[PDB]
Short mmCIF file of C-alpha atoms and ligand atoms in Angstrom, two decimals:
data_model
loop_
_atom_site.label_atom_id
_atom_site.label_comp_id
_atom_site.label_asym_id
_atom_site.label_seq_id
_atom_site.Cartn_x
_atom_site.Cartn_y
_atom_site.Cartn_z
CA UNK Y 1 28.06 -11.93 -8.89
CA UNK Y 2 27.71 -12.97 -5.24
CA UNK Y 3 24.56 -14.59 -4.39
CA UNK Y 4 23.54 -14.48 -0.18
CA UNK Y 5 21.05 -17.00 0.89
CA UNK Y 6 19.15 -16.18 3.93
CA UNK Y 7 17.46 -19.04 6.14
CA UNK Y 8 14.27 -17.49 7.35
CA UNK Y 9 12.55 -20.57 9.15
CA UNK Y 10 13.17 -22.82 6.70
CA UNK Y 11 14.52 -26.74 6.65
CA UNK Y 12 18.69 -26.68 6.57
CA UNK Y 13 18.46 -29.42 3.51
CA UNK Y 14 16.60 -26.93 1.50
CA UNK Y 15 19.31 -24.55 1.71
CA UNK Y 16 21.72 -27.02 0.84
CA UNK Y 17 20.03 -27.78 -2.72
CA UNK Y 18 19.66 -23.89 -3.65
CA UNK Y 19 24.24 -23.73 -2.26
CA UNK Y 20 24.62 -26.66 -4.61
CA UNK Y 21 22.48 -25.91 -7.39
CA UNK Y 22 22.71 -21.66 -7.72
CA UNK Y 23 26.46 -21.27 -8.59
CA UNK Y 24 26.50 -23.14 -11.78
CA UNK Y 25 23.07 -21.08 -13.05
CA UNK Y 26 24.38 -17.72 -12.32
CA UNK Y 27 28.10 -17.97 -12.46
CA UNK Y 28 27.59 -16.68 -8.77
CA UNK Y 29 29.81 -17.35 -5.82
CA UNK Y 30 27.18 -18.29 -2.83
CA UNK Y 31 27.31 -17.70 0.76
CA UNK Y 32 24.91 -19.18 2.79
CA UNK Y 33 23.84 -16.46 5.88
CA UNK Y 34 23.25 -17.89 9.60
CA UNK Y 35 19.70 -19.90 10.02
CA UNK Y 36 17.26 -17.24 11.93
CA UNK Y 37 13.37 -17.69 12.75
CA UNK Y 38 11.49 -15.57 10.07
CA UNK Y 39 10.82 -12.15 12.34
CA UNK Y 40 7.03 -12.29 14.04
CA UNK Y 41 7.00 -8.41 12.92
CA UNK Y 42 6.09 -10.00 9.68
CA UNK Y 43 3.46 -12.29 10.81
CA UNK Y 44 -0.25 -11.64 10.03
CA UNK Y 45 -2.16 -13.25 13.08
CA UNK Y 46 -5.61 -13.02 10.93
CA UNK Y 47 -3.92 -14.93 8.09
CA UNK Y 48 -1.96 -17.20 9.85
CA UNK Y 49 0.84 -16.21 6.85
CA UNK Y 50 4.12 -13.86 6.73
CA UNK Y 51 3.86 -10.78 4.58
CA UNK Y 52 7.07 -10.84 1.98
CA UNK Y 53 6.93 -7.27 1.54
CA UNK Y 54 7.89 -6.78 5.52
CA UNK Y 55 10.21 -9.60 5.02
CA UNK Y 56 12.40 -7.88 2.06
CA UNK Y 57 12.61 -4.83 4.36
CA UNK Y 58 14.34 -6.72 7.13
CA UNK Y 59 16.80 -8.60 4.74
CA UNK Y 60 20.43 -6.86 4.02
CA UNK Y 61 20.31 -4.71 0.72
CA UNK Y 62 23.48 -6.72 -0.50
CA UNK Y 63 23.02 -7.32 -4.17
CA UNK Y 64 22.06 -10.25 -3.98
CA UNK Y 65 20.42 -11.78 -1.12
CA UNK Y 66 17.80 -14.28 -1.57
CA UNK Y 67 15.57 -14.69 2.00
CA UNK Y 68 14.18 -18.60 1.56
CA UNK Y 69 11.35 -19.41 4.59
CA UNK Y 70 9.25 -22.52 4.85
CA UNK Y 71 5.82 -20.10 5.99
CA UNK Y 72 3.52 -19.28 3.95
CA UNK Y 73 3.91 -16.08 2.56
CA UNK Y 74 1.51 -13.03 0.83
CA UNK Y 75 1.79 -9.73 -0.72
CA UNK Y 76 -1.24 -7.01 -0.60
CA UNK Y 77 -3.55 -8.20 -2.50
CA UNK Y 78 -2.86 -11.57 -2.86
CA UNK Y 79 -4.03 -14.67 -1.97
CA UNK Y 80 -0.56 -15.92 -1.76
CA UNK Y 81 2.99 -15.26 -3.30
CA UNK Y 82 5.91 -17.74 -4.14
CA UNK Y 83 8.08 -15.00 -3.48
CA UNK Y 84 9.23 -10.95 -4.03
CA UNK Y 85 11.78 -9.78 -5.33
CA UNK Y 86 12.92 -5.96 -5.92
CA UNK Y 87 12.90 -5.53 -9.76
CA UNK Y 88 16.63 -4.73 -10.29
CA UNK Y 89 17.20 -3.85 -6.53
CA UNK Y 90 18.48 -6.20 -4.12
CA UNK Y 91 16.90 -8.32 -2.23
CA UNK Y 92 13.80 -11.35 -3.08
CA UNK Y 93 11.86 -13.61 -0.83
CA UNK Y 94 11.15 -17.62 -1.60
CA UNK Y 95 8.66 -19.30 0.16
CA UNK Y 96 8.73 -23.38 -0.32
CA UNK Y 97 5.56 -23.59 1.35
CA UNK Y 98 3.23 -23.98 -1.30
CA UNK Y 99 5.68 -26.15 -3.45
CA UNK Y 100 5.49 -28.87 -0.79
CA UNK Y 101 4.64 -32.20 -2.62
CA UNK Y 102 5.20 -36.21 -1.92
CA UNK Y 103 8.35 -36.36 -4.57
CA UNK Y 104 11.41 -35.19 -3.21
CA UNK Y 105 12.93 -35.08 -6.33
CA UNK Y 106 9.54 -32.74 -7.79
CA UNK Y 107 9.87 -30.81 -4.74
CA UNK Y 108 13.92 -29.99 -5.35
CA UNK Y 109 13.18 -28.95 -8.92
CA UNK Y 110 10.38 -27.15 -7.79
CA UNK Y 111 12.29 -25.14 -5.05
CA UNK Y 112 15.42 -24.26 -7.77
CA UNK Y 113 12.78 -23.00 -10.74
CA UNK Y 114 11.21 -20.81 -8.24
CA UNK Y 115 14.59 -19.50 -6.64
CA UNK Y 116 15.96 -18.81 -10.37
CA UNK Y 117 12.81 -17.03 -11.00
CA UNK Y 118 12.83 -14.67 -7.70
CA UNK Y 119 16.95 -14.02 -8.54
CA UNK Y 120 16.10 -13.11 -12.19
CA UNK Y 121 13.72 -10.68 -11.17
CA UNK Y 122 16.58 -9.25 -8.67
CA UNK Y 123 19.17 -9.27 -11.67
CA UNK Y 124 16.07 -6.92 -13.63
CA UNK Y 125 14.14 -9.35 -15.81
CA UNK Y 126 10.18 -8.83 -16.05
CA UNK Y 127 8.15 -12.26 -16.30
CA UNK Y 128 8.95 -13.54 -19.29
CA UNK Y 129 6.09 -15.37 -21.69
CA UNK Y 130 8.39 -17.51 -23.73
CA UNK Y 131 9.36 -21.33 -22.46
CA UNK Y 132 11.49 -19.59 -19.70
CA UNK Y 133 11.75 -19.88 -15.58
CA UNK Y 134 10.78 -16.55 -15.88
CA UNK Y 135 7.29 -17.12 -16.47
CA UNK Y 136 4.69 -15.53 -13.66
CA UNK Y 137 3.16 -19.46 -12.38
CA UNK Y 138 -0.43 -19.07 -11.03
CA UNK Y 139 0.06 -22.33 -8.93
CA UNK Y 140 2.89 -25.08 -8.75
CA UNK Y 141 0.96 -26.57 -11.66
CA UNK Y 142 2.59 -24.10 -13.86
CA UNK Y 143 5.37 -24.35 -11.93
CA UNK Y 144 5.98 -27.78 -13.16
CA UNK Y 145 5.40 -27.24 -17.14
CA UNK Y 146 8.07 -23.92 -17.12
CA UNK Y 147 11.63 -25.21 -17.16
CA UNK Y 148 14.39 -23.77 -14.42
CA UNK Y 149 16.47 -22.42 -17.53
CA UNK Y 150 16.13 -19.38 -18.63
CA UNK Y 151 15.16 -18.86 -21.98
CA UNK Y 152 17.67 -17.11 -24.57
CA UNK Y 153 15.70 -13.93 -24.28
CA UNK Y 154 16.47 -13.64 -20.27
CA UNK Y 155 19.71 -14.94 -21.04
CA UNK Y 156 20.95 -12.42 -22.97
CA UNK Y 157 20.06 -9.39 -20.67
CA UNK Y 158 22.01 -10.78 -17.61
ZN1 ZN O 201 7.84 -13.31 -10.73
ZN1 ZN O 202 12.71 -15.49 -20.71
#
């Protein structure tokens, strides 16, 4: 498995944790893709956020490449998203924007759990009930109380 991260507007050291931390969870070799601004095609000027489905379009489909952006980003319907992934496809979106917090160190484990979950959903697992990374988190709340592991459930179908 090859794993493509794609800056999208997003802080350098961020990338640097997910190139560090990714290869050992997925048995994946990473690549980290040249830093580019997050494309204004995907902006919504009313919302003052980045719409992730727009985003996933623009990203290579190069199983897999993970876009990770620092803006705020929403899906129809929603308020807000942590990310989007295609369900077996491709390509997700991470957003760190809502994760932001004081502790670095929260804010690191915060940023893996939620690229783990938007790459599980790439390699074809559904959210997940049991005490897995693959749960659906409302907020960063239940970000926090899922663990970045996935649970031997998920494990198995990768
Ligand atoms: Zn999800
Ligand atoms: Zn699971």
């Amino acid at each position: 498995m090859k794993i493509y991260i794609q800056p999208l507007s997003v802080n350098s050291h961020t990338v640097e944790v997910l190139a560090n931390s990714l290869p050992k969870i997925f048995n994946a070799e990473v690549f980290v893709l040249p830093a580019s601004d997050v494309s204004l095609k995907c902006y919504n000027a009313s919302r003052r956020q980045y719409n992730s489905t727009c985003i996933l379009r623009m990203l290579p489909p190069i199983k897999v490449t993970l876009g990770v952006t620092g803006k705020d980003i929403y899906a129809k319907g929603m308020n807000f998203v942590f990310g989007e992934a295609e369900l077996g496809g491709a390509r997700a979106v991470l957003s760190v924007f809502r994760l932001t917090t004081a502790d670095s160190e929260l804010y690191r484990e915060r940023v893996v759990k939620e690229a783990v979950h938007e790459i599980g959903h790439v390699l074809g697992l559904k959210h997940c009930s049991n005490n897995c990374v693959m749960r659906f988190s409302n907020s960063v709340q239940d970000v926090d109380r899922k663990p970045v592991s996935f649970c031997r459930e998920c494990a198995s179908k990768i």
